[model samples]
Target: SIDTPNYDVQKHINKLCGMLLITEDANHKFTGLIGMLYAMSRLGREDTIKILRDAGYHVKANGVDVTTHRQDINGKEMKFEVLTLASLTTEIQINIEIESRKSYKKMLKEMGEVAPEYRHDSPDCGMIILCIAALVITKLAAGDRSGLTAVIRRANNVLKNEMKRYKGLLPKDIANSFYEVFEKHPHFIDVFVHFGIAQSSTRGGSRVEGIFAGLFMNAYGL
Candidate 1:
């Protein structure tokens, strides 16, 4: 007989709530939204519903449309909706429309300042760079062109060297996971280059030394 491990719903719920609070306090609505979706992607449908309701949201499902009740920072009632829900795997595909009336331009302007908040002197600067890189990858996988552009532009300005340092510090398995995703999505290679973490090869392919070499190994199941 096969054995299955118990899934901890509460653990995931706590993580989702914490991410929401952090993003909220940071005034990063756009990033917060993406964070919420990423966190929720780890849970099952019923667990997702429970977390949403516990967080003061009213969830209603109409086919692929999932509507939720929310309030703005100004205490105005707002409607948030999910246009589609898909399985959560290494590859993320979900469509969400936040009705917060906050324009992408404004979000970009705000995120521009967020990059400078973390300096090399900070203790958690490496983790911050890693998180921002993950967020950029998430935005890219979700097909958020503007969001990807915004994050790459802002983060590259402040964390160019920090990203490189963090990449060097990543453990074998952890770094391989990131490379596995990059291998799956060739387009991500170009974006990572633009972010200054990856180097373009002279032979018409991305440089595959150090951590990035794991890309070929993982692709071949080595």
Candidate 2:
């Protein structure tokens, strides 16, 4: 598994959108995304890493990509992703969250043909990833491992290791902790941190992806 996830979760954001439809069963169905988010929080993780945890139903994180609100001309209003392990699949990843609460009602209207689909028909596993990444990186920097640890711990506190996995999230979060563990243990930072000359012209995700994400998390997953 690459510690650096390569999957683009933005392309998927419906699984959570479907759950936003408010109804009596909303709470029942929304819990899936909630747990996945908690998992991401616990481990301070981002990207497809949580997808594995959620899909396996191993009390880690899941993926659910969705847009909370949208704009006819501007675009989506507050779009984000989620990482949790509850109710889900490659297509229909059930979960509990505000978005789920919102989507449940939308789903009903769509079913009844009351509202037009806002491209949020039904997200897959990407929602979860989106939510987690957005949470950590909003003001987070690549070096703030300590702050990331807090995020992971808070998420675990919310869920309290309900799954009871040994390294569930907070224990040794993946996003930053995993990277730190690897860089620290083997002392790979000096040589691997900046493999080439730092060039502002090449300061883009593409460059980072080529060097970092492409070769991380060998033990966990891609």
Candidate 3:
């Protein structure tokens, strides 16, 4: 909700090692430490806030001392504390992101084995698009072509919404450039799967994750 903020998302990613924050379904999970802090504050996920504090990240919720004192609501403050890890290093967070994505894949694999719904979140938009592409590929692979158009349209909408939601996090031209891709590549589902981010067959994927990881580094000019 903070507007008029000038920040470098790539730098945040590199410094904060915030990729580990990637949630089960939201791409915004990779929005970085400050984003995560603000998100948890808004969500009132007190437990999560404490976890951050325990790891040496400075944290506060609505101006309450989330690390030491019991956080009682009924307070206010938009500007929060700055970095105070004293010990939380950049390498620590990098390991956290690696471990986190590893944990995510394990979680999804177990679920997919028991149940058919491999519904999982991705680290970046490329995989997000790949998620849709794989579904479409699966549909087409099975000769179910009736809903392809509708499905792709829906995917575009979700992508558009995600880009809009990220606001200052992504490159300013992301929305305009992304939308233009469809016109240039009408069969984008096939394109992405065949040549873009989507893998040919990613039953349980970290490859796509790595691909998007690189793509984000390049796309955001990290």
Candidate 4:
């Protein structure tokens, strides 16, 4: 028989809440209206406010600035940014400025030139959009494991053996790309569970100028 573990609310729920608190990237309010309701409903108003405030939302009076700008285009106006991380067992979610000149492409190329593993041929903001959309739906469906699993499966296929071969393995001679964005708390998981996703994502991700503008707009009903 497939023994289902007890629904230890204290244990599972605590981890869930921890995932919502620690790594420092909840960004609940950044998703806009639905994100807020989902947070308020799940974590309750006090905890939600506290988390956001701790992340620097200042929800008490300032109301927080979520829809800031992560980046902007030059004369061309082709916003969007690119990100690649090793922590991703299969997939990852990143933000973008979309019309920000050739900076996105250039940066991706530069990274590839420096290290072949961190290669992103024609990087843009699509994957990030997919991640935000998935997150919105996750919140909507209340952490839809099915939806997340679907995305992970698809991304896995896209990555295929590349991830398996070098998932967490980095050559000693190469400078760890993980350090590019990793410090104290790194990656979305740590951010989401620690500082609040929006706060950390915006502050980090090299996207403060164009944070949640084109992110998770209608997916989570935000």
List, residue by residue over 1-222, the lDDT tens digit for candidate 3. Answer: 111111222233222322322233333222322332222232233444444455554544332221221222237422221232322333343444445456456665765542212222223423433333333333333333555555456445544544332222232122222333333333332223233332223345554344434443332233
Q: What is the TM-score of each candidate against the true structure?
A: 0.21, 0.23, 0.20, 0.22
- Candidate 4 minimal-lDDT segment of 10 residues: 169-178
Top candidate, metric TM-score: 2
- Residue-level lDDT of model 2, residues 31-115, one tens digit each, is 3233233223323334334444434423333343432332232363433344322334322342334434455455557566433
The stretch of ten residues in a row with the least summed lDDT in candidate 1 is 88-97
| Model 3, residue 209: C-alpha shift (Å) | 8.0
Residues 2-51 of candidate 1 have per-residue lDDT tens digits of 01111233233233222222221222323323322333333334545554
Ranking of models by lDDT: 3, 1, 2, 4
Best by lDDT: 3
For model 1, which pairs clash? Answer: none
Query: Model 2: which ten-residue window has the lowest total lDDT?
Result: 162-171
> At residue 142, what lDDT does model 3 achieve?
36
Better of 1 and 2 by TM-score: 2
Candidate 1 deviant stretches above 4 angstroms: 1-29, 61-162, 165-222
Which parts of model 3 have CA positions greater than 4 angstroms off?
A: 1-125, 132-179, 185-193, 196-198, 203-222
